[PDB]
Each structure stands twice: as C-alpha cells, then as structure tokens.
Amino acid sequence: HPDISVDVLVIGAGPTGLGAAKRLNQIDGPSWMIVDSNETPGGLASTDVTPEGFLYDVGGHVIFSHYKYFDDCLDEALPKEDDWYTHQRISYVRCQGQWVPYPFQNNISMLPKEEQVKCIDGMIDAALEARVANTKPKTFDEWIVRMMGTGIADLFMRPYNFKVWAVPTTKMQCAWLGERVAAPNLKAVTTNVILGKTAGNWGPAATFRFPARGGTGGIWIAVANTLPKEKTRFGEKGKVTKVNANNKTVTLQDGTTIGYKKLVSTMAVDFLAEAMNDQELVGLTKQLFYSSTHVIGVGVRGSRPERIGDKCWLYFPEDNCPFYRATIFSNYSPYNQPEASAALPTMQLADGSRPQSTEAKEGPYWSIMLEVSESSMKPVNQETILADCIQGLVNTEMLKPTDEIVSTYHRRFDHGYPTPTLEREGTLTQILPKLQDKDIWSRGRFGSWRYEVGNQDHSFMLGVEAVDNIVNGAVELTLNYPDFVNGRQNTERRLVDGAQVFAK
Amino acid sequence: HPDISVDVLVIGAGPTGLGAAKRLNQIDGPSWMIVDSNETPGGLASTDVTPEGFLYDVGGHVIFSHYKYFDDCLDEALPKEDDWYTHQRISYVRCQGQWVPYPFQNNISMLPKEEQVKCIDGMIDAALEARVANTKPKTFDEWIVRMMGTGIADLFMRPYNFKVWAVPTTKMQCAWLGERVAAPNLKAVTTNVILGKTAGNWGPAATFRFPARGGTGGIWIAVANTLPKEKTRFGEKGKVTKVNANNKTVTLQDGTTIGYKKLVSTMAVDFLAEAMNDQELVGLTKQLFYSSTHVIGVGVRGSRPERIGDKCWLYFPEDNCPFYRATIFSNYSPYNQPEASAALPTMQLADGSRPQSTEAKEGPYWSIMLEVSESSMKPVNQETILADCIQGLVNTEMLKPTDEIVSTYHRRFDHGYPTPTLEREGTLTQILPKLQDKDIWSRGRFGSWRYEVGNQDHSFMLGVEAVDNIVNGAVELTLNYPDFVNGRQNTERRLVDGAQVFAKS
Amino acid sequence: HPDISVDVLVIGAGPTGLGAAKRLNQIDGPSWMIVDSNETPGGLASTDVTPEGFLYDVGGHVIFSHYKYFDDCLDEALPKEDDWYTHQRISYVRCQGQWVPYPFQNNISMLPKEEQVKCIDGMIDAALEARVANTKPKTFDEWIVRMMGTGIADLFMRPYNFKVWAVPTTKMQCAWLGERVAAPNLKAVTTNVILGKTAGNWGPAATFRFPARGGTGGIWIAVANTLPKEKTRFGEKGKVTKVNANNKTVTLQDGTTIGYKKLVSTMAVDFLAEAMNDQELVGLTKQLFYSSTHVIGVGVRGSRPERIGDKCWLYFPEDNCPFYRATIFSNYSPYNQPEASAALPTMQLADGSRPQSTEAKEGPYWSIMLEVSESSMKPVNQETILADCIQGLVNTEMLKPTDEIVSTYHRRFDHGYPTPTLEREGTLTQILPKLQDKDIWSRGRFGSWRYEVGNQDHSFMLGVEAVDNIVNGAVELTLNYPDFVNGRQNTERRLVDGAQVFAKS
Amino acid sequence: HPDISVDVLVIGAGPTGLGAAKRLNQIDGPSWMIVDSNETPGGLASTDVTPEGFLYDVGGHVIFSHYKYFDDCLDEALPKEDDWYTHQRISYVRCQGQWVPYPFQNNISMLPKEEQVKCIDGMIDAALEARVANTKPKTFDEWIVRMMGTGIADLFMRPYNFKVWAVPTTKMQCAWLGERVAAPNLKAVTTNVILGKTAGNWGPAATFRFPARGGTGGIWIAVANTLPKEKTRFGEKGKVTKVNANNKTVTLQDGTTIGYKKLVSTMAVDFLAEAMNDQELVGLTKQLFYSSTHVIGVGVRGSRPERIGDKCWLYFPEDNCPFYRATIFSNYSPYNQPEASAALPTMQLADGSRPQSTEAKEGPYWSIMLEVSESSMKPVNQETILADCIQGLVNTEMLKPTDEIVSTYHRRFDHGYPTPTLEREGTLTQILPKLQDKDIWSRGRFGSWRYEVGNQDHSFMLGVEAVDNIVNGAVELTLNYPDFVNGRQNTERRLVDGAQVFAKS
C-alpha cells in the first residue's frame, strides 16, 4: 500500500494546478494534495530576478480575465488596492522606421503612400472575394489573407507569425482564432487612410492590472499561500518521476508513493506519457508540436526615453531583430527594477562598447524584456542570442548606441508555445480520451495543449473545471469549447458558492 | 416567523420541478421542499384516462433525451425492461390523399409530377439566392422560404405551422430552429425525385421508448416516488396562492407560509407575476404569447387496420381536418387501451350516426390522439371541436364511416405552447433578470417560455441546472444556450457524481 | 401634278439634312432637293452674334467625330489650316469653392477629406453589391447608384442631371449613357485619393478643333455652300407647312408643291406629325419628352483673367446659379469676340450696377456662354434669367463684382434636348416604323429623338445613312445601334468612294 | 499591259465569289470578271453523284439564312415552288443505344436514372458557379462546362467536338460561339427530367428548304447562270497560278494575265499566300489550323426503315463509329437517289458479306451521308475508312447486318473546317490587314477563315459586302462582327435596291 492516499492528486502548481487546488480547497469534500518539482509555485507564470535586481517574467504576461472566479482568487490573494497597478493596453507594430499602433491595418496611413495603395488594393480584392465566399479557411495563412488581403498580410501577420510560432502560417490551423468570419473591414481601414488618421485599440476602458511586487510570479505565490500548507508538496520532494496508471500510483523522486482515485496532471502531456511508460501515448504525444521561448532581459540606465513613453508591448515582423515581441517591463511596476538611488556599474553600451568608467553610478533605470522563439524549423544560436537581441534593440531604435546597459538576463524555456498545427486536434482527440479512460485529467497550457485557452485565466479555470467535473459533473467548457468561454463573461462560478453559504 | 423554512423552495412538480427536486435530493446539502396544486405530479407530461379505459397524454409525447442525467432518473424510476416498449420513430405527412414520409421536404418524390416541378423550381431559386446571401433571416417565414423555396413553403411549411402555432409564420422569430425543421439539400431532394425514392429518417437507431403502463404520466409519478415524502406537498394543500418576493415568503391556499432563501418557480411566469401582485411583472408577462392545446382522444373497435400499421405520429397541413397532428396512441403501449376481451358498447359510428346495436361487445381496440391549437388569431369552436375532429378522421381516411367509436376524450389545456414570437426575447430579457434579482429562478416550458428547450428532458434539466447554479455556481446552459445543449451529448452530470462516491467512504 | 418632282426630298438643312444632301450629291443618281425655313443653314448648330459683335453658339458645341465621312466633309468645306483652332478638352466641375477635374466621379481626390470618406464609402457599397448583381438597372438613377454609390449620387450626379435634363434621374432610362457617363473604378479612384492625383482623361478625346470664323455655324454654312444652289430652297420660300404622306406631296408656305418618292424629314418629329395632320401620330409624339435650352451670353472687358485661364467648359451642379454649364467661348476663337481696339461702353457691372459713364473704352474682351434648361418639371423666369445668370457668375467667382459687361445675349430654343425617358423607346417603336411604312425617313436630333446619337457627327451621319439605306440598301447603323457606331472608328464610308473613282474612268 | 483588264477581279466561284459577282452584276458599275479552276461553280457547296446514281453534298448541308439578299438570289435562281422541298430541322444525338433529341440536355430523361442524377448534380454545380461568375470563359472547354456542367459535358459536347474539330476542346477559343452567357437553364433541364419528357427544338416554324434536284450544288449552278456568261471563266482556263500583288496582276494556268484595280480572293488564304510568293504571309498562314473532311456515302436498298423515320441529321459523340455526323440524305429530296423502279445489284451487305445473288433488283432506295474529320492530332486511314464507316452504321443500329448496300462513295476534302483555335485571331489580324494594304479582299470560309461566319449564306454575303465596301464604302459587318449579323434580321440590302429603281426611269 502507498505512502500517501488521497482522493484527488494534483500534479503541478502553475496556474492550472493551483486552480484545481483552490476549487478542491473551497469544496472541502474529497481529500486532496498538490505536488510540484519547484519550491516556488507559478510555472511559466513565475518571475526571475537578475543579480542586479531586475525582474523578468517568462516573456510578456498581461492578464485579461474571462472569469469572475479567477478574479475572486486574485482579489483574495492580493486584496489591497496598492497590491496592483493599472495600465492601458498600449501596443505598437514596428514597421519601416515607424511605430504603428495596433491593430496594424487601421494605421497604415503612417506607411509610404505607394505602399498604402498596395495595401488597400489587396484588401479590396479580399472584400470582393469575401462577398461570394462559400467555404471556411482551412489554414492560418488562408485566414490571414482573407481577412487582410495580400499586401497587409505580407507586411505584418505573415512574417510576424513565423517569428512567433517558429512555423509557417501555411502549416497551422485557424479554428483557434474563433468563429469570426475571415473578411476585411474595408470601410474602416480606407477611412483612416483617407483621413490620415491613426487609432490604437485602447483607452480608459481597455486596461490591465499588474502586481506591484514580485512580477506575475507574485500572484501565484500569494494564491498558493492561501492553501493549507500540509496539502502541498513543493520542491525536489515534490518532483514526480513515475505514474503507474494501472495501479493509480505516483512515485516521487525521493521514492515517496502516492495513491489516487482521480489524477489532475498539469505537466506537459509528452512528459506525462514518459512518466507513465506508455509507448502508445509516447508515440502519440510525439505527433504534437511546440516551440521553445528564449527570454532576454536588458536593464538600462536613465529615465524613460520620450521615444519609449507609455508603450507596453511591441511587435516585430521585420528581420532586423531576432525577437518577435518586446515589453517595457519597467512600465508595469516601479518595483520591477531597482530604485533610482541604487548604484550599479555599466556593463556595456548598446553598441557593444565598454563603458568609460567601471564606477557604480545611480539610476533611474528602465527595463526591456524580449522574446525569441525556437523550433526545429527556426534554430536559435544560444551563445550569440543575447548580443543579437541587443543589436536588434539598436536596429529598431529602441536603444541608442550610447545607452548604458546595467543588467542582462537570458533563459531558455523548453516548452514555450503549444503550436496550433493542422494535425493538433487529430492527435489530441486520441491522447486525451485515452487518459480520461484511466481517470487522468490532463489539463493546462501543455497539459491539454490548446493555445486559444492557454493564458493564465484559462489555465487556472481548466484546473477549476477539471475538479468540478470530477466532483459535481460540470461540463469542462474551457477545455472543449474555447469559443464559448472566450465570448462571454463567465460569472456563475464564485469563490463563495451557494454550497458554502448554506453549510454555515 | 413562517410555518416552514427551507433553503430552496420548488414550486411545481412537473418535469422541471421534479428535476430540481431530484438534484437537491442527490446533493443532500441545503434543505428543500417541493409543492404542487395537483395530487399527481407530471404537469403537461401527465396522462388522463377515459371511463371506458382509454389513456391519453397531453397530446403526442415522444421522448428524445439530450442528457445522461435524465436517462439516469428515468432508469432509476422505471428500472425493469418490461417497464418500457421500444418503437421506431415512424411519422408521415398527410398530403393530397397520400402519406408522405417525414421530412416532407425530402419526399417530394411522392407528389404529382406537376407539383414536383413547382417544388424543385422553388428550391432552385432558393439555392441560387442562398449562394449570394449575406444576411440572416429575421422571421420564421423568411427562414422557411430561404431554405425550401416557395413551392415547398406553400404546400406544407406555411399552412402546417399556422395550424400548430396558431400564429402566422411571419410573426415568429427563427433562432429557435436548429433541431425542429430540416433544411433540404437541393442535390438530395432532386436526387430522390429522379430515383423515385421515398426516404424517411427513422430506423433501428432512431427509436424512442414509451412507458408500458400509465402513459407518459407514469414516468413522473415513478420519479416523484423516489423523493422523500415529507419534503413534498402535492394537492390542494400545496397550491401556491401568494408570493411575497420581498419577504421571501410563499403562502399556500390553506394558509401555510413557507420561507425560502432561494425560489425555483416552474409555474407559468404570467401566473407567477400575478401571485407576486407585481404590476410591472404582470405587464411584462402580458407581452408574451402562448397558444392553447385541445386534446381529443378517440377509442375505436377493431384490430389495427392495415392502412394504419406501424404509424406513430402524423402531420396534417391541409384544410379537411382541424387537428395539426394525430398519434396512433395504441401503438405506443398495449396498456394505453382496454384488453380485447373488454366489453364496451358502441357510442357512435365515425360518420356521426347511431350504432345498429347498443349492446356491449368485445374488442380488440385501437386509439387515436389528436391535437388542435387555439389562440386569439385562430379561434376554435369548443362546442363542435370533438365532432369536427371525428369528421376530420373520416376526411383523411384514418377512419371509415362505419368504424365504431367506443370512447371519446376532449380536454383544453390553456397554456399549451410558448410561442417563439419576434418579441419573445426582448420581453424575456426584461422578465427573467428582474426575477433573478429577487433570488427567483423562473424555469420551465412556461417558467422560462422557450420552446426550443421545452421538451421533457429540457424541462427536467432546467430544474436540475437551476439548482446546480444555486448550489455549485454552474452555468445554466439549457436556459441560455439551447443550440449548445441540443447540439451535443450531455454526459457529464450523473445521478451519481464524484461528490456522492467520495462522501460514502 | 405638283410644281416640283424629285426622287428624294430632304426637309431641314441642319447637320442631319445636310448629311443627306451631301450623300445624295456624291452619289449623283436619284434626283433630289433640300428645303429649310431658315435662309442660313445649320439648325441648332448655328451661331448668333450680338450688336456689339460677340458670337454665341446654341450653347457649348464641341466636336468629337466618330466618322471619317464627317471629317471628309468638314475638310472639304473648310480646307485651310487657318480655318481652324485646336484646343485641349479642358473641363471642370464647380464644387464647394473648388474646380474638380472632369469627370467628377473619377476625381474624388480633389474634394475635402470628409467628402472623400462619404464618396468612397458609397463606392465600396456599390462595388460589393455589383459583385453579386444579376439584373441590369432600369432607370438612370439606379444606374448612378449601382455604379457610383449614394455619396457621389447625392453630391453630384442627381442634382447636376436634374439641372441639365430638367427631369429627375428617376424618370430617365439608362441604355443611352455608355459614352456620356463615366463608371468609376474603385481601385483607380481610391488610388488617386491616396496619392492626391487627378485622373487620366476619360475617353479617346484629348483635343478638339473649332472653326476660326463664324462659330460652329461657319461649318454648316460652308458645307451647304458645296451643294448645287439650284437644288436648295432656304428661307420663307422653303418652309414646309403641309405633308401629305398618302399622295407623297409636300406643300410649302408660299404654296409650292413638291412630289417625292422618298422623304427624309429632319424637322422635329412632333412638328412632322402636325404637318401630316395625322391625329394618331400627334398623339404618339406627345408621349415623347424634351427640354428647352436658354442660351445666355456675356461679353466682358479685360484680358483673360488668371482664374479663368485655359478652361473650356465648366459644370455647375450646385444651386447657387441657374446654369448647368458655362463655356469660355472666347477661348475657342479670337474671332468669337471683337478686337482689343474695338471701343465699347460698359453696359453694367457684374454686381448689377450701372457704370460710371457712357464712355466707350477699348478691350481686350473675353466671353462667357451659359445654358439653362427648362421643362414642365422645371419652369424658368424668362424675364429675370439674364440677371440671375450674371449673379450666378458672381456667386461662382467666375466674375468679380466690378467686372465690366459690354454685351448680353439671351435666346430660348424650345426643342433643346430630346430626353431619354423610360417611355422613349416604347413610343419611338410605334412612331418610326409607321413613318417608315409610308416611305418617310424621320431622322435627326428631333427627327428620331435619340440623344446618344444626337451630336453633329451623329446627326450628319443619320442623314447620310438614311440616303444610303434608300439608294444602296445600307444598314442604318447610327439610328439603331448607338453603341456600335460610338464604340468603333467608322472609316469605311468616304466623300470619295470606289463608285466615284471607277465612274471617272 | 495584261491580256485582260477589269476594275474588280473575283477569284473563286463558290458561294463567296458568286456573292461578289451577283452584287457586281446588280450594281452594274465597275467592270468585273470571275474565275474558277472548276468548270462547275459551287466550291464546297457542290454535289457529287456515284455511278449508281446517288448524290452526295460535301457532308450535311442545311441552309439557315440570316439575310434577305441571300433569299432574293436563291429565289431568283430557283423561283418555282417545286424547285424546293421543305423539312423540319430534325436532329438527334446517338447515346448509349438511344436516339436522343437535340438539344441533348433537354432529353436526358432517356438515360438511365443513376446517370440523370450525375448529370443534374453537375448542372447544379454549374448553375451555382454561374450565379457568382465575374469572368468570361477563355476556352471552348470552359464554355462547355459552364453551360452544361461536367456530367452532361462528358456525354456529348466534349467527345463530340473532338470528333468534329479533330482538336481538343481545351485548344479552341469560345468567342466564336457568341455573346450569350455560358450558364445552364437548370429549371428547363430538371423540369423535363421530372416529367419524363422528350422534346426536340423543331416544329412547323423551324424548317429548312432543300433543292429538288442536283443537291445543294444545284443552287449555285442556277445562281451562276444568272451571271452574264462572258464575264465568267470557269475550268482549267480559269485556274489562278500566280498573284503579283505589287503589280496588281493575276496569271492563269494557260498563261493568261488579268489586271485588276481591286482583288476579291476566295481561295484558301494559305494557297493565296503561296500564289503571291510572299514568304512573310506564307509563314503567317502556316500558323493557322484546319481539319480535312472525309465524306462517305452509302446507298441502301429498301423502303425507309421505321427506326430512321423523318430524321435529318445525327450527332455521334461515342467511339463505336468514326464519323461525327450522319445525314439521311434521301430525306432531303426524292431525287437524291434513283427512283424505285431503277435496277441495281447488291454490292455488299452491311456486315461485309457477299450478297446471295448479283442480279440487279429494283428499289426503292434510301441514302446515308457521313462525315469523318482528319488532322495531325487525329489521323484517318484512307484505305479502311469506308469499311469502318459501314461497320459504324451497324454499331449504331442505323443499318441491320442484313441491309443491302448498292452504292458507296468516298471523297476527301483537304480544306474542310477552318479551326477556331486560341491562336486564330492573333494570326488573322496580321494577315487580313496586310492583304488589305495591297487592295486584296481575302474573304470566305477559307478566304477569311472564320467558322462562325462560314455557312453558305455567310460566305455569299462576305462576297456581297466586300463588293459593297469596294464600291459604296459599306461596313463589312459579316467579316468583322459575326455576333452582330447572326443576331439580327438583315433585311435592308436587296437584289433590287433604290439605285436600280431610280435608274430605270
């Protein structure tokens, strides 16, 4: 008989696992337990800090919540108004020397006139074709061009998406974008071109909140802390090494065995198939595709340059830089980098030069966070990528050659994006029902591998809904119907439900 | 303090209310109680019997379940195999002296050739227009025309639907439609006309099960029997007369008061507004529309005639009869009518005349159940409707003039169909949230007034999900997303869920 | 027996009749003669002069020739290079204080940003509707909206066309406009908006030639002069009063009778019906519609103003002036107005005041020619129309308040435009074949009433082709197929054909 | 100075040349003469006779006239009523053991049901595509499929047209087919299928007349005979061997030289280029494409079989026979074959066996005329083609194995069809203008190489209009605008025009 027995075991304490745990904790029915190999919960929603005191998330993390329940747990965890900062959702596309407001097509007035002509002509073709279309697009590429036309597609979404996904747009499905018809808003686009108008999709209503301290990672430490500590096992002692699906037994690295009746696994599903020693599942998970993410962080001396201003995140379709996205992380919280009086030496100038002096000087400081994707179709030279990113910062006029870099950061995350390939659904609908037959609920960004429900709130709710299905017979809506949950505000499920009110 | 206090009060013990009850009973958390003014649970899913021993449902009731939870509760209530009879879903449309397999719009093949031309020409126009359409249809009529063309619309869809809904197709919305009206492929319809093929949509997979005894009403009597009796109050002692929403207090006819934390109300929402003495809610509910259903039953002497055969239900678009639908109710169970040795005198011949003898004679017997709709746009002469129906049976050749009728039944059900009018949703999105703000879950066929989720399984689950929302913060999917629940197999929620498994150890 | 007998009698010596006479004269087979009530041939293609020496055509007359035959005859009649001046076809549309290059609908790029949006949005709508359109437009208005969208329709097409046709766009057909109304290309128009460019000249017409002396009327005086004088009868002596179609006899006002075998009538067909004393025909011609043309002439002291420059004709859709078109007639020939040394007193200033003195001062002089339409749907105040035009010239900034006016001219031409009404073709197909069966070829701008073949070259060729049909069995292509003759270069028929070349041997 | 001088020389006395000659003769102006290498006029519109007395045209020749002038000349040539026979235009398609009335698609109810399904499914696809089409088809093959859909295309027009043109449908243009939109009449086709109806496109109105004697060739003998004999030169004495364009001189085989001012050439334009010894033109003409025609005649003993009946011509898409078209030539005139009392021996039975006797036996007789095409893409074994044709008659059940054949006929015509290749116009617009610059009017079926104006009436009028262009400056409509002349009733040009009427006074 096992060392420990619980009704429901949760593997992994990123957002998905912590969602499952919060719901089990609230229900307070079946016994339960959560394990993670890391001492610190959060998964890919964690945060690092450099020796010089610059924080970096695992790339740009901006919360948009589709669920009251998710909101309830964040409010519980970080309940003070000064636990958070609010910002507008300000983003731009870098294109031919210009910062073009997102969405790109509504702002092509900034481009040269001859190019505007090409863009409008292409979108006219797409509008005329959309008017008689009687089939759905089958690939991401087809969807892009039917929405945007050839010209606008070639400038942004085609080269941008290869830089992000590390696979061509022709090899991805397009159902994950939702059920919106692939057609141009020709009038809107042409109107701004005629008016010479620019317009971003943000304002006092289009906002996000970001944690005052600890980066995105601070949220999940705070949420985890609301759980009964004896029901958690985090660290080397919590690393899962073996899953015996037939005996419903799990073995940890230190040899501890855990028996379960139901399993919620939030580890990557290809790792799960190995831990199970299931040759059939290993073969199937190997049919899936993912990209790795390099996160590069750069700490810069000086007050925030006028050219940067209130920018939050930025897209880079062009090939003069390796990164697809940059984040002005110092704009998210004053505590993402040291205060102005902190003294740091200059490590190098942006052009690669040595500084005049080695003396530690004061701030203030700002901070840029970069993302570079990697796959077997898009290799990344690990040894030069930092320097390539810094050159890319100069090329894109984010840094001057003279800017003083005081901190650098580079980390590679093996599983970064689960790719919406054409083959994905054919594979997942074999994998997930086989796990289900064994009472294994494999869920999460890489637990169930669906990018369109792959953010923090989706993940958290995948765990919540998994538990609700296990206990109360709930439909796993986020898992099976992304369009459904993304197109509504999910208000019904709360951190305090009728059941707990009636109980007291 | 009131006579009784419960966390959750359920008003009504038709399928919706019973569903609430069953889920509350399964959860076994909050205290609850269920009331009904009728001693026998079942609502519009009840069954009547004539003095001569012929059973009649409230019109044609055929079960198609979208939910394993519903299946579970029926199986629990009627667990034996001989509790049920299984049949194929055989229906036809009476059209110009002939029985056309349902769906009509696919058996074009069976009409006079000249009419086939008319139909196919119309459908060709519709196919070409559909090729360039970029707007959705706004009315039931526009929808019908767009998917079938004028010829088929006129021959069947338009007249039949006025006969059922008792309002013209131009007066109804079309969002409710996915699962009720078949949209014909031009190539499929044309292929069947060329091949001279008649192809109805039934067979070994498309079946239904019907209770062996007690009619459809037998289900809900048995389901109710699985509830703890003390938590029920059925009869005059359970008739709700006043609802004080602000004090969260209900008053019954005998004067009993019941306090509640949450209310699940399954009575017609216009009745609820009146019981609340809420003039604003009364005015809103009056913007809703419903039709009444007349149910007529006819018991016939004789073994089942060949011309009837295995027919289950039948549609009547034409003018030679007042009913829109007939059910061969004696095909559903042998216990829906007397055994063959039962002796019964003839009451009349089908042609209206007196029988040659008034002596009681033996069977066998078969049985027809007819439905006639009524509204302010379609008045019905209540005094002659029985005789009109019987003449309609002679007219459609279902009865011979000389057939011997041994039993008759007629009952009017005031609230029969909640009409999907153009105005329905604008009104409901005022009514339901205003009740919601008062912790009142108004749910069911007339509780929430949505016909597209108005069958027995829909109703039952409206009750279940209401409770699940109240207790576990579940999404009321059936209520707000008919297309979602009707388009899938709903397997997740069971009569035994993990909660009960884990608790019992 | 009548006073005169010819094989072919030609009535009218405008372009159409002169066309007939020239071809008859070239063929030199059948006997013929041509009559006109006017001593000076030319009809609506004539020219007046004011006592102060300013010439005015009957409104803006610019020649574009579709036929080599027409070229040959103009060349014969006015053979010297200094008989002609050549000009670029420079026109603009007055809109919101701006001059928009013709055609308006292709130069959206010139309007304010706000108006550009309204225009392009409209054109996008039209482009998308046109992608799935399977019916041709019935009316001029439907055509305008289908091809240009509501924005350009409201801003220019609808007001301008009522102002010139003197009927709403909804009352006209749209089969006539292939060569008159440009259909805008969405990509092309949008591309020029983005680049802020003007559009390439619509049509093959880049320049035009205009006669050095006598205005447009000089051409027809000279063409007529090439005819044998004995075969003409112009003046009171040549006015037709009676046409006896059954006797094939024509009576002139002086009592002269002319018997004919074939008749080419170029007078207005409604007048012809009257002269025929044919009540049925009069009835039919009254189903036709026409507008009247007021021509207003204004002679101005001064060297040609910079704001005027090389402008030729100008369009005015706006309601701040009565005229639909202005022509800088002084740009067409130096001899359309007096020498600079000619001394003329100021008659009035453009603001309407009397001048300081009666002193005759020298020039130079320039000249504006205006057109105002009239019909039963659009009355014109004859007594004030001159002053209204002059104020119009001030509102449109064509004249400064202080500009000195040295000559004025006003003349009303009752039949100005044959209106392409919805009813036109139905009526003409009852009229023209009836006349045909009586050996009457009724042809010309009002002879056959078809504006799309109603220019000088068209008219001339209607007379030529009518004679060719009569003598050589030719197809009357211009009469029956406007799109055919307007869409090709008609090079085959010449002033010297093979017949004449061989015969001279 | 040449042996003979004329103003206009016409080469060739087939229909085109005779048209030119008839119009020259009528105009009676410029001097002219017509030459031909054959003593008998008619060209490809001539008629042969076998030693047994069976006549054969050059394949099926049926007159549909688009011109009054053509009717005038035919009626002048053969003015008596008994010079002609009148018949309805009765034709069928041989398909899967059936004679299917033309047009094929309106008669597919004769096909097996499963095949009707595939045909109608294809045409539904075609109609749905046509509804949103925004481009014209570019090839004959695209035109066929857009009009018929795949299934119907594969059964008739695709395999049939390869058998006719001896080139694939994918290699031909489709503009020659005219301006009608390539689109299905889906309602018409489905209606006849639903009704089980067959219907040909003939009846009392849709008739042709055929000469009573001498076949089609009789027409042109009679027309030629109205010409003044001394202006003709037919036979070896009239064969042109050299054309010197730069000197406007023609040389005949007997050494006679003719000087002309204008040349109308109706010989094949590739021969003309060789005769001109113009290397550039020879290169260009070699870019053109044409098929050769084999004509096979079979004379059969017996009264007309019931299975043949009133059939006139027949299409053969299938590959169980080499011919694309058959004509029941004995149905055109009783004088196309010997009278019944004429005695002929049997040459063979249709299955190839010897007759039991070689005695002459009497008739009556009927007659079949067949056409086989030949090109480099589709060779013909001249040695076996007769035997293959006769086997084809058995395969198609036109002849029984036992039918007695009393006469056979085979002749190959090198220039048979001028092919409407994709490249044709690109080449012709280089050839015809260069010849035009030399005062050479190259006109006719192979004179101008355009099949869509390649019938007898078209050809005759090409000559007429060429002369009219030379003399009177007429537009050459038939040459340059096939759609125009084929879509109208051409009634203006007559054998007696005004010119002749007036001159005779």
Swiss-Prot record, chains B, C, D:
Effect of mutating residue 445 to A: Lowers the catalytic efficiency by a factor of 2000
Disruption phenotype annotation: Exhibits a marked growth defect, reduced cell wall thickness, and leads to the absence of short beta-1,5-linked galactofuranose in the galactomannan and glycoproteins of this mutant. Strongly diminishes conidiationa and increases susceptibility to drugs such as voriconazole and nikkomycin Z. Displays attenuated virulence in a murine model of invasive aspergillosis.
InterPro entries linked: FAD/NAD-bd_sf
Residue sites binding NADH per the record: 66, 89, 91, 417, 445, 455
GO biological process annotation, one example: cell wall organization
Listed result of changing residue 105 to A: Lowers the catalytic efficiency
Effect of residue 180 to K: Lowers the catalytic efficiency
Residues reported in the UniProt entry to bind FAD: 16, 36, 44, 59, 61, 240, 325, 445, 454-456, 459
Cofactor binding notes: Binds 1 FAD per subunit.
Pfam families, per database record: NAD_binding_8
Gene3D superfamilies for this protein: FAD/NAD(P)-binding domain (3.50.50.60)
Protein keywords: Cell wall biogenesis/degradation, FAD, Flavoprotein, Isomerase, NAD, NADP, Nucleotide-binding
Gene Ontology molecular function terms on file: nucleotide binding; UDP-galactopyranose mutase activity
Ligand binding (UDP-alpha-D-galactose): 59-60, 102, 105, 157, 160-161, 165, 180, 205, 315, 325, 417, 451, 455
Keyword Nucleus: no
Residues that bind NADPH: 66, 89, 91, 102, 201, 313, 315, 417, 445, 455, 458
Enzyme Commission numbers on file: 5.4.99.9
Subunit (UniProt): Homotetramer.
Family from the record: Belongs to the UDP-galactopyranose/dTDP-fucopyranose mutase family.
Free-text domain note: Contains a flexible loop (loop III) above the si-face of the isoalloxazine ring that changes position depending on the redox state of the flavin cofactor. Residues Arg-180 and Arg-325 play important roles in stabilizing the position of the diphosphates of the nucleotide sugar and help to facilitate the positioning of the galactose moiety for catalysis.
Classification via PANTHER family: AMINE OXIDASE DOMAIN-CONTAINING PROTEIN, PHYTOENE DESATURASE
Name of this chain's protein: UDP-galactopyranose mutase
Organism per entry: Aspergillus fumigatus
Source organism phylogeny: Eukaryota, Fungi, Dikarya, Ascomycota, Pezizomycotina
